Write a protein that binds this DNA or RNA. Sequence first.
RNA 1: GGAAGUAGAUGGUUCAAGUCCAUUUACUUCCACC
RNA 2: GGAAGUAGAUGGUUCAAGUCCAUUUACUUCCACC
Lengths: 441, 437
Amino acid sequence: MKVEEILEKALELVIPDEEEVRKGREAEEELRRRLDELGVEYVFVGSYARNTWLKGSLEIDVFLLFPEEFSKEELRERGLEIGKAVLDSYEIRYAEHPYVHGVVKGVEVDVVPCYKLKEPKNIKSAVDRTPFHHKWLEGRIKGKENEVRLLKGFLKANGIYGAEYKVRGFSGYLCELLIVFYGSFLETVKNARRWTRRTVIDVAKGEVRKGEEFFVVDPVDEKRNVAANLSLDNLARFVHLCREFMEAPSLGFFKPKHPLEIEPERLRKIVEERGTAVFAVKFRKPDIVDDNLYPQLERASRKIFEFLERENFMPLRSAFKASEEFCYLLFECQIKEISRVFRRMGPQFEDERNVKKFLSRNRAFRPFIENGRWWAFEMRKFTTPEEGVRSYASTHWHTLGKNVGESIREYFEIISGEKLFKEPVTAELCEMMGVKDCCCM
Amino acid sequence: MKVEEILEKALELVIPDEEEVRKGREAEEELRRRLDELGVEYVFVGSYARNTWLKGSLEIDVFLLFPEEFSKEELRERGLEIGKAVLDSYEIRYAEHPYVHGVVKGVEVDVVPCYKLKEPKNIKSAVDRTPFHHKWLEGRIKGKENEVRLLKGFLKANGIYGAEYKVRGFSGYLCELLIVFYGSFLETVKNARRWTRRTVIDVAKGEVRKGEEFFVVDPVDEKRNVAANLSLDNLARFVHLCREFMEAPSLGFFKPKHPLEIEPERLRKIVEERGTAVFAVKFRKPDIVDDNLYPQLERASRKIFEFLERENFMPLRSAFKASEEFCYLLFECQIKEISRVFRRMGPQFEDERNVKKFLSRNRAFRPFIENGRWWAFEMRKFTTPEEGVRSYASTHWHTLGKNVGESIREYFEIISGEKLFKEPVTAELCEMMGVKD
RNA sequence: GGAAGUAGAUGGUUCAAGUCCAUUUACUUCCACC
RNA sequence: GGAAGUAGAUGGUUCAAGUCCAUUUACUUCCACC
Ligand SMILES: Nc1ncnc2c1ncn2[C@@H]1O[C@H](COP(=O)(O)OP(=O)(O)OP(=O)(O)O)[C@@H](O)[C@H]1O
Ligand SMILES: Nc1ncnc2c1ncn2[C@@H]1O[C@H](COP(=O)(O)OP(=O)(O)OP(=O)(O)O)[C@@H](O)[C@H]1O
Ligand SMILES: [Mn+2]
């Protein structure tokens, strides 16, 4: 179909209906009656206050403005007090900046404490720009909300919406800025296509520039990269998505895909067809927030992956999963088994004193001469990748992030092959190996 | 036994006995008589003519002299004809410069044609320097001819004596030059220790030097490297050898130990203990002289070894063997079997046009992005180093040396596992695998 | 918590470490959690 | 026959390989067979 019609149909996927808006307005009225009764300085920020929220994804943001003089400790104490005071029921978990998550009249709320500033240049808390963002966006976003919703739909469906470490994709606010910078979803997509990894997009200045890295300049604070946590890979995924959408437009880009329930039998065959070593490390999930788990999970992966590569097991790709009570670290290797013996470089034949030291050692085989250098044969303490990481992880748990490294210490195991296939990691496995035709809807 | 007491014993193995020399002088008188009777300018050279041959292996060198006017061909025709005429039973097989190998009274003989030059500069024939070697070295070795004999046995018990491509070792002449430079086998051994690949020995002026690479100058032709064919590794073996002898001297350094008969069962265990892929390419041996063969076996093997590495089989070492009718290229590999899928590198996402082509190629698995750029899983054609070289040797036979290549082109088998060990390549596997029993 | 940078200092590995594998002190950043 | 080198001519691989795998024509050495 023509791109214009594909977008009209996409709007039914991304615009909240009056069921949900009603439910939000009267959630807003209640929240206000409560906060007013409490006589506190507050301000509605975020997608709800600018009507740029997606269908079925409503969350109201209430900011409480405290005096700049307040300590970090007082900011916490009162923040949570009011937040608790104001919600039908609540929940407190945060990685660094304190807030309370909760519900009023069946709708989700974040009540967040912050400092009231005259300038967002220099910032006490980490969220101090948010009420300035809104003030910047408030007038400039009007009548473009649906463009925003389209871009947020396109992103979510394609798994790259959100700046959190779990996603490392596009923040909601980044979406709003882009729509402001580019006019419309379509125009964002059409331009997105020629973003290099060095595209600097200075919204306030209306400029596109070449810099050291991809960088969206926060209108509100110039030092701030709005896309600071957008992975170079997700940037790439996005520009590819754009190029692909404009060749062949489709409502598909706006509907999300889901892993297909794949038989432990079919992927037995797939793995053996590939003939690779695939195994995971299974360990108990440290009870910490998402934004803390995921970097350490990434870290754990890199470290073993690198261990695997300097040990010549020739790793391909790595992935991870965090279930309810377990985390897995998945790997695939080209080498299932390596020989016991390997080569070690020795001193040049002339360097007498070091040659002395080099054959000093007790070795099963005699060292030889090659291209005018001594060389030895020595044994490996392991010959398969599973054996390797079993050893690596046992002795190097410390280096695997503070919390997983500790959970791995208390207990970890290796699962490989069919045993591993009855674990809730198949989706990653499929994804990791580039398995075709295993996603749907 | 002290230092000099080891050269004493060795003398019986290096100096020719009563019988051996006496069979020479008469086999020499017999030779002058036929050659004179033919009326040729000829002159005796080499180890026998300088009383510098090792006991047991004697070879008389006779040089036919000719005017410079003779064509490349003319030199060759008379050279062979006079040769055939002079010897008893005789043999011709050479790689470039025509000589004739034979037997007289019972001993082995070489008769080589060459041109009578004024000076060994712009040397016409290949071997023209030999008379001019003799003319300089005769009167400078008169009495120290037992210092070469000690050096020769030493190097020949170590299989690193002989400049020919099967040995890449020390030339007989070079050893003679090491005595005239140093004065004694022992002193030669002393300095050897601080020899480097950077060494330039100048016999002409008697001066050690750190020039280009290793270079023993010929005082007869300054531009010759008398050490031209000594390998870097074979150098390395001699200099380590001399370090070992100096610190712990033995007669064992003169005994030629006979390549261990390690049973086919024993190393099947060692190879399985090492857990490595160890196979050989077996093919019919081309009917060519050694000097054209061994360089081709070197090349053949080098090329396959380099294939192996670039194919991620992680080879350790290689070796080769020439038998009656067969040749063997041996390899050992860390990887017995590699996965079927591998990674091909794509282009950076920004490059729309190359990304589009890279994605258009039919594969079995979705390509992915990693660290900015596209990557693709691809299926290998072979999963074992054996399947590997079968495929390589099949297609690249021509790059594997002129003749060995032709031979591989006709036929070869890849032998490994149980079948390999019952073939005449065990000696070479031990050496290659660094075995001690 | 993660990442980055600066000035360190230890361990282990190697014939050989400022470089490889870990550890740790000090300091300046940044990101995520809104 | 092998190797080092100067001046080009292709062919395969690959998204791209003037850089990977090969091939080829000249002129230039050099080594082994003594
Ligand atoms: N990573 C971030 N970078 C910049 N601003 C942020 C970030 N996270 C939150 N904010 C600010 O806080 C506001 C509320 O953010 P929140 O995480 O509640 O999502 P949102 O912007 O409301 O959009 P949506 O609800 O559609 O995901 C944002 O509009 C923005 O001003
Ligand atoms: N590669 C070489 N380089 C220089 N000179 C050589 C070479 N090969 C042979 N010659 C010359 O030809 C002569 C005869 O060589 P031949 O191959 O018969 O052995 P040799 O040097 O006489 O010693 P032996 O016969 O004891 O091994 C030598 O004395 C030497 O002068
Ligand atoms: Mn929100």
